[PDB]
Design a protein around this ligand. Structure first.
Ligand SMILES: Nc1nc2c(ncn2[C@@H]2O[C@H](COP(=O)(O)OP(=O)(O)OP(=O)(O)O)[C@@H](O)[C@H]2O)c(=O)[nH]1
Ligand SMILES: Nc1ncnc2c1ncn2[C@@H]1O[C@H](COP(=O)(O)OP(=O)(O)CP(=O)(O)O)[C@@H](O)[C@H]1O
Ligand SMILES: Nc1nc2c(ncn2[C@@H]2O[C@H](COP(=O)(O)OP(=O)(O)O)[C@@H](O)[C@H]2O)c(=O)[nH]1
Ligand SMILES: [Ca+2]
Ligand SMILES: [Ca+2]
Ligand SMILES: [Ca+2]
Ligand SMILES: [Mg+2]
Ligand SMILES: [Mg+2]
Ligand SMILES: [Mg+2]
Lengths: 338, 425, 54, 438
């Protein structure tokens, strides 16, 4: 019988995975500090990778890729895209971003800022970190930071109708021990229930699509869709009736392309192919879509939460693809080949 | 040349000690006359640990036979290997101990202990480098229990830097001679807690159940019980008598098995136990070796936790399969092994199996469940002591009731100590 | 890659490849600690013999 | 020419040392009786091989080695072994009873009584040396002698030979072959006491050697003989520069200069390749790029860890066989464009390379197959701290309950030395994290 441990009690995703493993009758949960385990549902911070794979007669698997923080951090993601030749400074699907400390890129950020101001182009930027400020004057942004990143705020976002409202697309991607990239077929659009107003960026209810900000500061929460969450079936139908296109052609192709580029970039540095232990990990990609139907990458979450309607299917998929593949018992994913 | 001095005291001690020398003598190719007639140099590579080499290439067991009655020792001298023992190593009295700890420890025994120490001294003076001592005895009688623990105290005083190891047979109402056995056993246990480094707890209650339940012996005898003890004693001493890497001597065994000085009471186990020509696979040896029905202490291991475990596999078998099966037992029941002692299960393999078996396995566990043995004795002790029943046999030899109260308290402490580590996280 | 300090002989050769530039206790004190531990052993044994004498 | 004295302590050090000197004689053409036909200078000379071998008037080449063990059975195998004629009785030192896997017993109790004898026997070898470089100390971490007596010997060596360098070949404890539960205690106790006395230490984790033997040699249950023959190959690759003509790592001082910028961080990671089974008639000979690329595979390291999640402070490549500098640089270029190799900012990103044209020598009838070329990478990477983390964790688990502590106090050691040694390992882990983490 396979054994496993739980070291992140706050993980809603793997709390279901653990519940499923127990229900199989072929998995046994041990104390969180017992080393004779086959699988570790590790903690978010300071997971002791150095102590894995040193148990004789135990194939050990962990649900996190050591080093994947480079991709799942605001400043780290920016540095990775600029310095990595595979992604290049000429990356077209990632907004222009800079890392500013309260090395540093203060002078470089203001350089491109002055260029836009002269050319009369939309010179709005957003500052954030791992509390956000959206301003059109650079002076306010730097004064606000006093580790943060400043990237071009997409001023022409694709707005859903009715509502004239903003949104963002969350994609769940599972990478197994063999580094197969599995994209969950089910996504979620976290929509803003307020009409987009490009006049005053201080009212962030219509500019931030976060599921929490919409349920706390938005007066139209849940008006158009249950919980400001639109799934692909409805969103695809809209794209057909409104823009005469499909979700696959107009957006999904660029999303799969971006997921491959990011994960294949760090594969040499995090792959556990010839390692004494194996890793998998569930990622949360967040994309923006502009009025031209171009997809932009916003960030990548290393410990994402699933949608309520999708926990069952996705969590069951994690067991089949990531766990049972290494520990067999007695498709909902799109395999991104590479 | 790391010599061990063997001592057997009392009826039980001498009857089991004799069988022990009969068993290991056969394994090392020694005949009842001390002449070696083996076919493998492994039989002689470590023969000096237990045998002296005399004139004519004779091998003399380094054994000392002690008793306050000559009866049982006369049987030894007439037994199968009776002629192999050094005649001068027979030290005995005539009065006996009457199953009375006070007589063996304070009166009858005190008069004979000095002559025993003289023989022990003669053996030690010829040891190139004495490891320590090995005592066989019961705790329910008078000589092995009372005088045995007296000898241990005086051996420690004269050899304080040597290891003391004992095979101690615990009494049980199922296989009982007198009602005072709980008294004698409770008094001895405290002596063992202080003055031994390693004690194999052999529970006559377990030996009886195994003979009746498993071996299908409807009317088990002491000889039947002693068959299990011989096989177990041969197994637990394999790592001392043959070349090996793990627990090769008494001190290294203590370092691996005793995390705390007072918790040095082990549960021995043996496999197979057949009621007989079928081959026993390595998975079968491992499962049976860890099964409570194969334990010699009548304690349910699943009622406590393993502090340390020593396993010994004998015979020609796949060492890779031994490692896989041992790792399977731990990994499939890791909740019974304390987590604060990493890798507390050590395994050894000896190519020479015991007589009449293609392969076997001996289990040596330091489990906190051993407290059930001491609780059992503690309850029987108190049932009588609360009414001072049968105390006159002991006060008549100079003992006071306070010494019983202190022995009672000491064993309850020992039980409490096992309990705190059974809960420790 | 810059190869520097190349040395060759009959049995082999060595060199360096640069890919990128950069960006006690005394004898007495020991004897004391050894004797200190030995003394602690003598004290523990004396206590044992005292206990056994009782 | 400057002499080097090898000291072997405990079972692991003795049996490994026995396997090393067997390989040296094969490499240098020295026969079991000590004779060396290719040596034309009879009874003397200051050749490179003389750093490890002295010469008698009769033409015998005697290893500059000392074997110490508190139990005689292991050294007795050297007295009656194949190369028994190489050594003389004064070189072999044995006791009556061992340290019983107890650091305190080996350091304080038994060490105090035999230390003067060992130093005296070492003094005899030093008297033969016109310019002694230092010492190479082979020992285990988990054994009572290898841990306890080695730390005492190292302390005294710093007193009697202050200007001499000292290098260690240490065996990290692995439960798959370990023989004691308290080996984490002994490992940390001896590392603490020895840290300030070792200039450079090469740790070999038995787990790594064990798996390499099972994986690459097809050994179902590797023995110490299997493990020691592979370890002697690694040790030989590391000491070849001292025994053969060359310009890299030609003296013990150069090891610290090339591999240890910070003194406390003096545990280089060793990676060896290729390890080919001799049970297969033919095997595709690996190229310079293939064996060099294997130096960055954790499966070939002497200590399982992930250098990708660390930083390099220095990196040496020791080739043996058909290898020319052109192929090395070409392979290094490819590996850079494919491997995660990060150096600390205050260090140049580079590789010191050494090539010996004589291909590796294998014990006739052993398990390792002859190969046309092999390499041993010595890289000082912070990733090796994972071994310290594993060891310190097991220490913490047992010491929290004071498990087995009474065995050490009973030998005269104070319980405070435990926490004193643990706090030192805590500082060591912190230094590694500061050097190779952001
Ligand atoms: N690689 C290798 N490891 C060994 C060898 N012998 C022992 N070991 C390891 O060393 C550790 C035990 O230390 P030993 O060297 O055997 O003990 P010791 O140094 O003789 O000290 P004592 O306790 O006095 O016997 C265990 O982890 C063993 O796995 C060997 O020949 N080769
Ligand atoms: N460059 C940009 N242009 C336009 N809108 C942006 C933007 N960056 C962020 N946003 C908006 O801000 C919201 C939150 O941003 P971000 O994802 O960086 O913070 P966060 O980490 O707290 C949410 P999550 O962890 O789910 O991704 C996004 O949903 C998006 O609608
Ligand atoms: N296993 C076993 N137990 C015995 C034997 N003889 C006696 N006993 C047990 O030992 C206790 C009696 O001790 P005994 O040796 O006769 O007393 P002593 O001669 O004065 O030391 C009782 O609990 C018996 O059950 C024997 O041959 N084998
Ligand atoms: Ca009398
Ligand atoms: Ca010469
Ligand atoms: Ca120094
Ligand atoms: Mg986030
Ligand atoms: Mg009787
Ligand atoms: Mg030893």
């Amino acid at each position: 019988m396979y054994t496993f441990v739980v070291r992140d009690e706050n993980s809603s995703v793997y709390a279901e995975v653990s519940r499923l493993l127990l229900a199989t009758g072929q998995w046994k949960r041990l104390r969180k500090d017992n080393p004779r385990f086959n699988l570790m549902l590790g903690e978010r911070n300071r997971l002791p990778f150095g102590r894995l794979g040193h148990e004789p007669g135990l194939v050990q698997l962990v649900n996190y890729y050591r080093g994947a923080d480079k991709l799942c951090r605001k400043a780290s993601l920016v540095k990775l895209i600029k310095t990595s030749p595979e992604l290049s400074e000429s990356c077209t699907w990632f907004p222009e971003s800079y890392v500013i400390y309260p090395t540093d890129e203060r002078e470089v950020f203001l350089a491109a800022y002055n260029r836009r101001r002269e050319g009369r182009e939309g010179n709005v930027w957003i500052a954030k970190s791992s509390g956000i400020l959206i301003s059109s004057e650079a002076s306010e942004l730097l004064d606000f930071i006093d580790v943060h990143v400043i990237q071009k705020y997409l001023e022409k976002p694709l707005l859903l109708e009715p509502g004239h409202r903003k949104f963002d697309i969350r994609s769940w991607v599972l990478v197994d021990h063999l580094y197969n990239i599995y994209l969950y077929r089910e996504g979620v659009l976290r929509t803003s229930s307020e009409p987009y107003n490009s006049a005053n960026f201080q009212d962030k209810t219509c500019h931030l699509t976060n599921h929490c900000i919409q349920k706390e500061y938005s007066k139209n929460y849940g008006r158009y869709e249950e919980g400001n969450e639109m799934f692909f079936e409805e969103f695809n139908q809209y794209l057909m009736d409104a823009l005469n296109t499909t979700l696959e052609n107009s957006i999904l192709l660029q999303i799969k392309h971006i997921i491959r580029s990011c994960l294949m970039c760090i594969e040499p540095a995090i792959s556990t192919k010839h390692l004494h232990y194996q890793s998998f990990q569930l990622f949360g990609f967040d994309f923006m879509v502009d009025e031209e139907l171009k997809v932009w990458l916003i960030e990548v979450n290393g410990a994402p939460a699933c949608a309520q309607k999708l926990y069952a299917e996705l969590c069951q998929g994690i067991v089949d693809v990531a766990i049972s593949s290494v520990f067999p018992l007695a498709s909902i994913f799109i395999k991104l080949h590479h | 040349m790391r010599e061990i001095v063997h001592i057997q005291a009392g009826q039980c001690g001498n009857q089991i000690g004799a069988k022990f020398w009969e068993v290991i003598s056969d394994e090392h190719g020694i005949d009842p006359t001390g002449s070696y007639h083996g076919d493998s140099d492994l039989q002689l590579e470590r023969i000096n640990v237990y045998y002296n080499e005399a004139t004519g290439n004779k091998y003399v067991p380094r054994a000392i036979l002690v008793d306050l009655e000559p009866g049982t020792m006369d049987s030894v001298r007439s037994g199968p290997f009776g002629q192999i023992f050094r005649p001068d190593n027979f030290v005995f009295g005539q009065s006996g101990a009457g199953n009375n700890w006070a007589k063996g420890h304070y009166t009858e025994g005190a008069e004979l202990v000095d002559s025993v120490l003289d023989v022990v001294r003669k053996e030690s003076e010829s040891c190139d480098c004495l490891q320590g001592f090995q005592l066989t005895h019961s705790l329910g009688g008078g000589t092995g229990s009372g005088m045995g623990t007296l000898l241990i105290s005086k051996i420690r005083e004269e050899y304080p830097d040597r290891i003391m190891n004992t095979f101690s047979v615990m009494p049980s109402p199922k296989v009982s001679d007198t009602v005072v056995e709980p008294y004698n056993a409770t008094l001895s246990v405290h002596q063992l807690v202080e003055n031994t480094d390693e004690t194999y707890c052999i529970d006559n209650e377990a030996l009886y159940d195994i003979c009746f339940r498993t071996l299908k012996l409807t009317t088990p005898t002491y000889g039947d019980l002693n068959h299990l003890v011989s096989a177990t004693m041969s197994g637990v001493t394999t790592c001392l008598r043959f070349p090996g890497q793990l627990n090769a001597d008494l001190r290294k065994l203590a370092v691996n098995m005793v995390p705390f000085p007072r918790l040095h009471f082990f549960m021995p186990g043996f496999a197979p136990l057949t009621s007989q020509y079928r081959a026993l696979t390595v998975p079968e040896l491992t499962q049976q070796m860890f099964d409570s029905k194969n334990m010699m202490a009548a304690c349910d291991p699943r009622h406590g936790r393993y502090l340390t475990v020593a396993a010994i596999f004998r015979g020609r078998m796949s060492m890779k399969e031994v490692d896989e099966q041992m790792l399977n037992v731990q990994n499939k029941n890791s909740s019974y092994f304390v987590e604060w002692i990493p890798n507390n299960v050590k395994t050894a393999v000896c190519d020479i199996p015991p007589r009449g078996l293609k392969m076997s396995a001996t289990f040596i566990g330091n489990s906190t469940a051993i407290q059930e043995l001491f609780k059992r004795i503690s309850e029987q002790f108190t049932a009588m002591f609360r009414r001072k029943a049968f105390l006159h046999w002991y006060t008549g030899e100079g003992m006071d009731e306070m010494e019983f109260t202190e022995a009672e308290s000491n064993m309850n402490d020992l039980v409490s100590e096992y309990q705190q580590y059974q809960d420790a996280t | 890659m810059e190869v520097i300090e190349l040395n060759k002989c009959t049995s082999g050769q060595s060199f360096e490849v640069i890919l990128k530039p950069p960006s006690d206790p005394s004898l007495e004190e020991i004897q004391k600690k050894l004797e200190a531990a030995e003394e602690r052993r003598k004290y523990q044994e004396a206590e044992l013999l005292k206990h056994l004498a009782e | 020419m400057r002499e080097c004295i090898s000291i072997h302590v405990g079972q692991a050090g003795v049996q490994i040392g026995n396997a090393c000197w067997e390989l040296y004689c094969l490499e240098h053409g020295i026969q079991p009786d000590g004779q060396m036909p290719s040596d034309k200078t009879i009874g003397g000379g200051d050749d490179s091989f003389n750093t490890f071998f002295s010469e008698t008037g009769a033409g015998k080449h005697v290893p500059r080695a000392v074997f110490v063990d508190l139990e005689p059975t292991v050294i007795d195998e050297v007295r009656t072994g194949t190369y028994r004629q190489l050594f003389h009785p004064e070189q072999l030192i044995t006791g009556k009873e061992d340290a019983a896997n107890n650091y305190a017993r080996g350091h304080y109790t038994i060490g105090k009584e035999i230390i003067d004898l060992v130093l005296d026997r070492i003094r005899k070898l030093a008297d033969q040396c016109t310019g002694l470089q230092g010492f190479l100390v082979f020992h285990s971490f988990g054994g009572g002698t290898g841990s306890g007596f080695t730390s005492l010997l190292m302390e005294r060596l710093s007193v009697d030979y202050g200007k001499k360098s000292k290098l260690e070949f240490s065996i990290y404890p692995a439960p798959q072959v370990s023989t004691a539960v308290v080996e984490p205690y002994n490992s940390i106790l001896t590392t603490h006491t020895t840290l300030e006395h070792s200039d450079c230490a090469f740790m070999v984790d038995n787990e790594a050697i064990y798996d390499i033997c099972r994986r690459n040699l097809d050994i179902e249950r590797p023995t110490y003989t299997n493990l020691n023959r592979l370890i002697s190959q690694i040790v030989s690759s590391i000491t070849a520069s001292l025994r053969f003509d060359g310009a890299l790592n030609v003296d013990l001082t150069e090891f610290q200069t090339n591999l240890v910028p910070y003194p406390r961080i003096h545990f280089p990671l060793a990676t060896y390749a290729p390890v080919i089974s001799a049970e297969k008639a033919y095997h595709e000979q690996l190229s310079v790029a293939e064996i060099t690329n294997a130096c960055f595979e954790p499966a070939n390291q002497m200590v399982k860890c992930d250098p990708r999640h660390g930083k390099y402070m220095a990196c040496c490549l020791l080739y043996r066989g058909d290898v020319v500098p052109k192929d090395v640089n070409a392979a290094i270029a490819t590996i850079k464009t494919k491997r995660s190799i990060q150096f600390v900012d205050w260090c140049p990103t580079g590789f010191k390379v050494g090539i010996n044209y004589q291909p590796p020598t294998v014990v006739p009838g052993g398990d390792l197959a002859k190969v046309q070329r092999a390499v041993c990478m010595l890289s000082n990477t912070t990733a090796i701290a994972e071994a310290w983390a594993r060891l310190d964790h097991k220490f913490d688990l047992m010491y929290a309950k004071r498990a087995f502590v009474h065995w050490y106090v009973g030998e005269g050691m104070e319980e405070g030395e435990f926490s004193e040694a643990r706090e030192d390992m805590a500082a060591l882990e912190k230094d590694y994290e500061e050097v190779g983490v952001d």
